[PDB]
Structure 1
């Protein structure tokens, strides 16, 4: 279509630096706007990178409240691409294994298992998170 591609290749590293500097609440709004342009454009690969990007920023910055709020929010966007949400959940369930803090891991599991409920494209993940939740 109007595939953005290099457009997100210009923002994403720039947004990566600002996240480390401390500006996170503002850049996610910037990436939310950039996600909206890509999602409407039906750019599968670009939108997938943004959704995977934002969850990484909230993970590396230990923003557990913001990470869970974002996961719910970006999954509920209007006409969200199913493959892009899959990559977000696949990348997010990796963060589940890394996290050792039980209350934080459980809330992320409950959040992730809620955004993957009833959806075929993320049915493998929700299974593995259900297995992960059971072992805990």
Structure 2
């Protein structure tokens, strides 16, 4: 079943420039349902973590120009929509969040040696408003520790 999620991620990374970005939002609620269910062997927490790593790679390559506040809006519009569908836990504890947080601060630390201070402190002030009242628990906290070490 994650072969469908593999071929849709294979459909996105080739077609970020050809296809328009709203089709990623038209493919957003499908991967939201694939992250929701959770099965034994077909889809798994590691395959869910990789499919979010590929879209956040496609959303950072798309927002690698001066226009950055689409990935910051659409993820926040994704994380808010995933809260209102699910009950209290989002789906899991680590994979959908902590890798992608460690992805973004890896993207931020790579971009800061070329990019200006504006969209990255827009990025830092958006994730500081995330990790002040969203994911403030342990597992993990080094992704927040190097965040405020890069923020300072």
TM-score scaled by structure 2?
0.23
**Offset, 1:5:** 0.5
Q: Structure 1's 14 and 7: CA in aligned 2 closer, same or farther, altered over 3 A?
A: same
Structure whose residues are more often helix by fraction = 1
Deviates more, 1:111-120 or 1:40-49: 111-120
Per-residue CA distance 1:85-134 (angstroms, 9 max, x = gap): 99733899999999999999999999999999999999999997248699
Between the two proteins, the alignment pairs up a number of residues equal to 136
TM-score scaled by structure 1?
0.25
**Offset, 1:37:** 13
Deviates more, 1:51-60 or 1:24-33: 51-60
5+ residue gaps, structure 2, are 1-16
Between Structure 1 and Structure 2, whose CA radius of gyration is higher?
A: 2
Separation in 2, partners of 1:27, 1:53: 31
Separation in 1, partners of 2:81, 2:49: 20
Instruction: Please report the RMSD computed on the Cα atoms of aligned residues, expressed in angstroms.
Output: 12.8
Q: Structure 1's 109 and 123: CA in aligned 2 closer, same or farther, altered over 3 A?
A: farther
